[PDB]
Design a protein around this ligand. Sequence first.
Ligand SMILES: O=C[C@H](O)CO
Ligand code: NA
Lengths: 218, 218
Amino acid sequence: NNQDELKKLAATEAAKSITTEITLGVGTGSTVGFLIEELVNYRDKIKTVVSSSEDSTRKLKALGFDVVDLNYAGEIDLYIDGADECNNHKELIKGGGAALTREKICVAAAKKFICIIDESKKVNTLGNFPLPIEVIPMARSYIARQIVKLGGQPVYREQTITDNGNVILDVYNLKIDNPLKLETELNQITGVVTNGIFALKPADTVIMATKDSNIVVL
Amino acid sequence: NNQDELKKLAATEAAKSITTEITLGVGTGSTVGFLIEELVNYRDKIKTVVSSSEDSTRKLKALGFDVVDLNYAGEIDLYIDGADECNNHKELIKGGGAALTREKICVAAAKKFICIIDESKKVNTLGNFPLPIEVIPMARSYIARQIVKLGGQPVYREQTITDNGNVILDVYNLKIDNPLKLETELNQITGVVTNGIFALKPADTVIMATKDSNIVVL
Ligand SMILES: O=C[C@H](O)CO
Ligand code: NA
């Protein structure tokens, strides 16, 4: 297997979109890890870095990058991040491992979002990967009940805490054939901070490393 | 303290709805302070107490009530709270005391929501009192910009952190003629934790103390 080589390929290809002086936004996760290492070749163009997690921030600072709060940066020119799932319309499930809320905020504040994935993330319909939802701890049980009513199977990630001080519910069993509609419905549930459907603002570009080490750009 | 007398009047009237043994939900603020005080008369009827703020929890425990986390309380039977504004359809603006998120969660989980106000909170169109919006800190400026596109004037509430570790934007200039629509569209903004429009789940009962010390029930 060469999943790491595919991740590195997609990350290396994406970094080439850094062609001018920008405020760069950086995702979280294993694929982004390869992207972060590649950024040492673009120091002349990276004016400002905004980070979606403390894990990414730690890695970026170790490489000599000046990571600033989004409030100080204003807007991101280019945000680069991975995904758990990507469908045929560049709509994503994100937030599996960490950073759901700040990743979604970074995407919102970014003029361009490039998603980097290996082929295993590519699906026709979202939902096989469980949907992460970050929730206010006090509302966890109420929200789980409302998700049951929506047809999902909610599970509490017991003892997990986000860097926003919140908890996570994973939703299993969902066939998400209408991402726009379900992302909207979940946003309406009191106590939901963020849900992991990235559809209302999808990826602008998807760089996919294929099983044969080719690059396909959606 | 004429207004204080009106608030005590409204709170005393609401407390009389505690007729059977219930799971009680407690709001936040000066009006609720008079209700909490009155709760000593209803001890034998209050099995469980859920609190909407740390401030209310300290007060409730100072009077020897057992404050119970909503997750093991399950469903609130009766929630009593105040508001910043109440229109003609029992749709509210809340969050002047910065506790809107947990208050909104309590309302969602409550079988009956009783809102207690003096007549100065009664309006025909919501929005003259600034709409509070709880916001993930890193998303503050981004959200401020989006609020401007909705015709609002966002002002960061200085030196204020919520029980949930978040910041508040107070939004001026909105004429909220369709609170259901605006509440829905603010829920769609990435980084918004809770907005202070209580309309999709309005109050079930409003108890209003008028300027001539009478009680009007809406
Ligand atoms: O405490 C002040 C306001 O009633 C918050 O809703
Ligand atoms: Na939200």
